[PDB]
Amino acid sequence: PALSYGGDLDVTQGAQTLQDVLTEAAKTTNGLTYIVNSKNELTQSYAQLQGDAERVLTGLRALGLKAGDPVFFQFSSNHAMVTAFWACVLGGFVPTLVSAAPTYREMNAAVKKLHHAWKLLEHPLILTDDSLIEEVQGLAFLWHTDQLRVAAVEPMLTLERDTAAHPAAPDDSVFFILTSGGMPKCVEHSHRSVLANVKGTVAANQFTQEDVSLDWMPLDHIGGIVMFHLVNVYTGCEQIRARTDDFIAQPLRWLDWMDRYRATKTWAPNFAFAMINDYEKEISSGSWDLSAMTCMINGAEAVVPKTIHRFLHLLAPHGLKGDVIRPAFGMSEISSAVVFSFAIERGDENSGVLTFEETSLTEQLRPAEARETGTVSFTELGKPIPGITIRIVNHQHELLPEDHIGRVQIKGPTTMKGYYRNDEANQEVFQADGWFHTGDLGFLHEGRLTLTGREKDMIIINGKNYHNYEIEAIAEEVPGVETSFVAACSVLILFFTPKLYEPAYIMRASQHIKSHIATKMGLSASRIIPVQGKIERAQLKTRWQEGAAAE
Ligand SMILES: CC(C)CC(=O)C(=O)OP(=O)(O)OC[C@H]1O[C@@H](n2cnc3c(N)ncnc32)[C@H](O)[C@@H]1O
Secondary structure (H helix, E strand, O other): OOEEEOOOOOOOOOOOOHHHHHHHHHOOOOEEEEEEEOOEEEEEEHHHHHHHHHHHHHHHHHOOOOOOOEEEEEOOOHHHHHHHHHHHHHHOOEEEEOOOOOOOOOOOHHHHHHHHHHHHOOOOEEEEOHHHHHHHOOHHHHOOOOOOOEEEOHHHHHOOOOOOOOOOOOOOEEEEEEOOOOOOOEEEEEHHHHHHHHHHHHHHHOOOOOOEEEEOOOOOOHHHHHHHHHHHHHHOOEEEEOOHHHHHHOOOHHHHHHHHHOOOEEEEOHHHHHHHHOOHHHHOOOOOOOOOOOEEEEEOOOOOHHHHHHHHHHHHHHOOOOOOEEEEEEEHHHOEEEEEOOOOOOOOOOOOEEEEEHHHOOOOOOEOOOOOOOEEEEEOOEEEOOOOEEEEEOOOOOEOOOOOOEEEEEEOOOOOOEEOOOHHHHHHHEEOOOEEEEEEEEEEEOOEEEEEEEHHHOEEEOOEEEOHHHHHHHHHHOOOEEEEEEEOOOOOEEEEEEOOOOHHHHHHHHHHHHHHHHHHOOOOHHHOEEEOOOOOOOOHHHHHHHHHHHO
């Protein structure tokens, strides 16, 4: 059946709280390195991190924070954010990991979302940088409130160390983290759930203390805080941090950093690999030594086969091995990645990729050879990590067999406590028998997960759900329609290329399109809409990942 178990996981072994993790890390000689520019870096050993955290703890406790209070993080500096996080860990405070607003001058979507979480958490202290504190204080005017409370981190490092750490229990809440989506929800995790993912991820990837980590993704992203940062401290390995805006400005800096620091592992969503591919001209005029890289995780969004293979091809002359890319899938609600694929290879472009007939997406998937049209290719995302169970169910939540697209559900010890102060939302995701409803769509093959879409993308008609490729099919049925792409809109849109570019030929195929779909479906004819000088090397989906990501 479409049910895959990652194997047993000894969660009783190793550290049980994040305070133990920092202690075992403070005993090593490794630590963190913060990149500031091409010729400057700030270092902070794990032993030094522990000390700095105790100093900020003195400050936080001096502002009235008590064990269990939430703290609203608004940081631009990696050094301050990492230290604030571990100060809260020592004091038992609960950080709220959310990104900083693009601008604090005007009322934008980001500022409204910050207000929602700030109000939901009952006006917690906002912890900030010296660089950002000037902007964050402007929220008092945008929010029209007198309860705003802000404080910077740098002045707190000049205090003595408070070595009286609040004794934490595994089930205690460790931090909040905001999702993407309307208003964002507030995911609440515990020491036990985050550590279960760390321990499962270390076992699956064979991470060790000898790794050298490089990450420029935000720490307010679950993959930045758990999959990498906390994994790095749990293994005690060396980790290097860079600012996200520095990569977006000059993507090739990712290659400089990997070479500069001889990094062995890094990650990014698919758009970052595509951004690098756009620099093929300068990549062929540069020089990098990437022979140390062994793990390039690709996750957080759809992993495009053409993207990762062009990536491996461009960087081969610079020493990048052909098996370093590891597609992965995860969510904030399950404390980051729960599957990793180790099948991508430069030579064999079909390894770790599955191609099927488009006509089989609604039934048992029919394998097929890649073709100019009529087929679809998906990147396999791998088996579940130890301790995780994945299954695929239909719209009645019944178990499906493999090679059938369905609703992805997760069961394991990495699952959140739940959305904060939203019993209703928790009921929708927490199904009976301990299954978490991801909202994603995919299938299982040989125990390996592959995502194909999201419930959010389905279209409801007559009180029943349908896929965009189901509607597109009835349109291709119409004579004179070569191919078609649909896009549901709010006051149905159907693009189609005609077999013959001739007016009355195009007008008749357009009529039968608006009519045939209007009769195969119980919808008004008016609702359906048929429609009919430069070349771009970048893929269409990949170019949308870049625009959405940069903005
Ligand atoms: C690798 C992980 C650290 C990613 C993660 O943990 C995160 O992305 O946290 P987030 O809660 O913000 O979003 C979760 C939503 O991202 C989507 N998603 C993630 N990985 C994907 C993939 N490999 N292919 C297609 N979609 C993917 C999915 O819809 C999911 O439900």
